[PDB]
Amino acid sequence: SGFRKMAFPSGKVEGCMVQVTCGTTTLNGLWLDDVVYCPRHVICTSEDMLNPNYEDLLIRKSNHNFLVQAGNVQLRVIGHSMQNCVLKLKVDTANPKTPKYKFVRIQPGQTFSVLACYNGSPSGVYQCAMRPNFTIKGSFLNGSCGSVGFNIDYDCVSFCYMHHMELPTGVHAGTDLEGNFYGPFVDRQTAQAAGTDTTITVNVLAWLYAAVINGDRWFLNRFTTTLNDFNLVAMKYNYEPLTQDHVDILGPLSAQTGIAVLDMCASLKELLQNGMNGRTILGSALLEDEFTPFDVVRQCSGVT
Amino acid sequence: SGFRKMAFPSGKVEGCMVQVTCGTTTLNGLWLDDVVYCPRHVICTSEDMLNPNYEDLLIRKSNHNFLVQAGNVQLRVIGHSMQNCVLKLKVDTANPKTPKYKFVRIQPGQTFSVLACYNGSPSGVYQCAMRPNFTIKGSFLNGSCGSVGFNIDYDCVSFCYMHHMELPTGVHAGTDLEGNFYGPFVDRQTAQAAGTDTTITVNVLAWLYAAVINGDRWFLNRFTTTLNDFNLVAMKYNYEPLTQDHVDILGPLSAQTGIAVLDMCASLKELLQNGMNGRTILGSALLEDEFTPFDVVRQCSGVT
Ligand SMILES: *CC(=O)Nc1nc2c(OC)cccc2s1
Numbered sequence: 001s002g003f004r005k006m007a008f009p010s011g012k013v014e015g016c017m018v019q020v021t022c023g024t025t026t027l028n029g030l031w032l033d034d035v036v037y038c039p040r041h042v043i044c045t046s047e048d049m050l051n052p053n054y055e056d057l058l059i060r061k062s063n064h065n066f067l068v069q070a071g072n073v074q075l076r077v078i079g080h081s082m083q084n085c086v087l088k089l090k091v092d093t094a095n096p097k098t099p100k101y102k103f104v105r106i107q108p109g110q111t112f113s114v115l116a117c118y119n120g121s122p123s124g125v126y127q128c129a130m131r132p133n134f135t136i137k138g139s140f141l142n143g144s145c146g147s148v149g150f151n152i153d154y155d156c157v158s159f160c161y162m163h164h165m166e167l168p169t170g171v172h173a174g175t176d177l178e179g180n181f182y183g184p185f186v187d188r189q190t191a192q193a194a195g196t197d198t199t200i201t202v203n204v205l206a207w208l209y210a211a212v213i214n215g216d217r218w219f220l221n222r223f224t225t226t227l228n229d230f231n232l233v234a235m236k237y238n239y240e241p242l243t244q245d246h247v248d249i250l251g252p253l254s255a256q257t258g259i260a261v262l263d264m265c266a267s268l269k270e271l272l273q274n275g276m277n278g279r280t281i282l283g284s285a286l287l288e289d290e291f292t293p294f295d296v297v298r299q300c301s302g303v304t
Numbered sequence: 305s306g307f308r309k310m311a312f313p314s315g316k317v318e319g320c321m322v323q324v325t326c327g328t329t330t331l332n333g334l335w336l337d338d339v340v341y342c343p344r345h346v347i348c349t350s351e352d353m354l355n356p357n358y359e360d361l362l363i364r365k366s367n368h369n370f371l372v373q374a375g376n377v378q379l380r381v382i383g384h385s386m387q388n389c390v391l392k393l394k395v396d397t398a399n400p401k402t403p404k405y406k407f408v409r410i411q412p413g414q415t416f417s418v419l420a421c422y423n424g425s426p427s428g429v430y431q432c433a434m435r436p437n438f439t440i441k442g443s444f445l446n447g448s449c450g451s452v453g454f455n456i457d458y459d460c461v462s463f464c465y466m467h468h469m470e471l472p473t474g475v476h477a478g479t480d481l482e483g484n485f486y487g488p489f490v491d492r493q494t495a496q497a498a499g500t501d502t503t504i505t506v507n508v509l510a511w512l513y514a515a516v517i518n519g520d521r522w523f524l525n526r527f528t529t530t531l532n533d534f535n536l537v538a539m540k541y542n543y544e545p546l547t548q549d550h551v552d553i554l555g556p557l558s559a560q561t562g563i564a565v566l567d568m569c570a571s572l573k574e575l576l577q578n579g580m581n582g583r584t585i586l587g588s589a590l591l592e593d594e595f596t597p598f599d600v601v602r603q604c605s606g607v608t
């Protein structure tokens with residue numbers, strides 16, 4: 001029993017983090033086989049960041065200007081290229097600690113672990129979600145860029161995020177490992193406002209199932225609802241519309257608890273309309289939306 | 305910017321987790337040098353757990369009854385002994401992945417990372433605090449016993465917890481790595497109720513400093529207080545009494561923000577008396593008490 005915001009074990013990713021220095025800019029890179037992946041803005045000064053022309057800035061850069069350091073040993077850069085917003089630095093040595101891995105582009109509402117790194121050294125790990133506005137609410141200080149987000153399926157790391165930007169509102173933007181930004185963000189120090197941070201409805205419901213499973217049941221009520229009726233209330237409270245796809249995804253949690261998805265919807269509807277009245281659910285005073293149904297099943301069943 | 309509940313990177317501890325099987329009981333062990341540490345109740349059946357005599361149960365056990373498996377390779381047990389509530393299994397092979405480590409017995413209010421393991425395989429990592437009632441609010445399913453809690457200072461793992469027990473109220477009890485229980489708990493399936501779960505006042509204050517640092521300032525007020533006046537309000541709300549030691553520990557956060565500790569106390573006092581009025585602090589609807597002052601400095605300064 002007990003339900004926690006839980007990150008994947010970080011060991012497999014710790015073994016991939018390097019320091020990348022171009023001129024006087026140092027950030028983190030991901031070393032997989034004989035390639036080091038890092039944000040292309042490693043080539044920028046703070047001046048450059050106001051209006052960078054990356055292709056032009058890159059012409060002034062050779063392999064030997066990219067200093068790659070793995071622990072206290074230097075890697076030899078034998079090639080470099082820009083793919084979207086990342087640089088791929090070919091090194092002469094395959095990372096001996098390369099895990100089985102994939103690059104996946106996640107959808108909003110999907111959760112992943114971040115290994116916060118500074119100077120290629122891991123400082124900590126935490127669980128995030130890709131917000132519906134394609135931001136993440138991270139913990140990222142200067143030097144944190146190139147820190148990655150990942151899921152693990154048994155022994156295979158799926159890398160889904162690389163950290164690039166803080167928005168003036170203190171939320172975070174970055175790319176998949178093909179260097180494509182999540183949402184409309186760019187690696188430019190410019191006016192970039194996030195859209196509405198909507199609540200991931202299917203994740204709240206998943207987490208209400210986790211609560212019932214772990215003994216927190218005070219918010220179960222006598223009501224049901226329909227997707228259309230629920231969705232009217234979702235709209236009002238800036239919750240993502242719930243689809244039949246979400247209902248199907250919650251099927252296993254429905255089965256195990258014996259609470260129909262639409263009944264749990266009715267519980268969520270009353271919680272939105274009435275608030276928590278000073279009560280907590282799994283030690284939270286608000287509705288948690290950064291557990292997926294898959295996360296709840298995993299933690300409630302003990303998958304490794 | 306951004307402030308997250310952040311665990312230490314788990315790699316150094318992942319490399320220490322083994323499976324320990326005695327008869328039909330399987331749980332996790334910690335392999336440091338040529339010793340495997342595990343809960344002594346690995347020798348118990350569920351029947352045994354109602355009233356175990358461990359010294360008597362142990363006489364029926366030889367080295368070859370303790371099956372230790374590191375990944376898919378078996379370790380040879382060449383000795384065993386009971387120290388308090390842990391078994392120390394001497395194996396013929398030093399763990400090649402042994403990190404620099406210490407065993408530390410933490411005080412209530414101190415935070416640590418847990419690497420949840422099942423069958424010697426890591427499933428996830430999360431941040432805990434030793435509660436003032438010497439419980440922890442973990443996520444621990446069957447097979448989770450022998451999972452450990454730790455802090456990391458640069459390259460040195462300080463192990464402070466090993467998981468032993470779930471209380472019927474769904475909270476968690478365990479030992480330091482000398483096998484001494486935190487609080488009055490025992491490795492017996494008996495009536496064991498936790499005392500008052502008081503709030504760790506110095507940790508809430510630390511986290512209010514983290515909020516100011518990260519831009520959440522709405523709860524700063526025009527008032528100050530004294531330790532004695534604050535403590536009257538703490539008593540009423542089941543908050544730990546604040547000492548001059550706590551004030552001194554908060555000194556660095558005081559300095560960096562320019563908010564005197566006692567002024568932040570006055571902010572906390574108003575929050576206790578008035579509630580949050582439906583507002584959030586660092587994305588929380590309640591006062592977070594599982595960040596230490598040291599945790600806030602570390603995350604706010606980017607230590608690795
Ligand atoms: C996200 C992150 O760490 N960005 C960084 N940018 C710089 C920089 O830009 C001009 C100079 C020095 C270090 C860093 S880290």
Ligand SMILES: *CC(=O)Nc1nc2c(OC)cccc2s1
Pocket residue numbers: 328329330331348349350351353445446447448449450467468469470
């Ligand atoms: C905390 C934990 O995982 N305890 C376990 N106890 C047993 C047991 O006790 C009778 C039998 C089989 C497996 C486990 S794990």
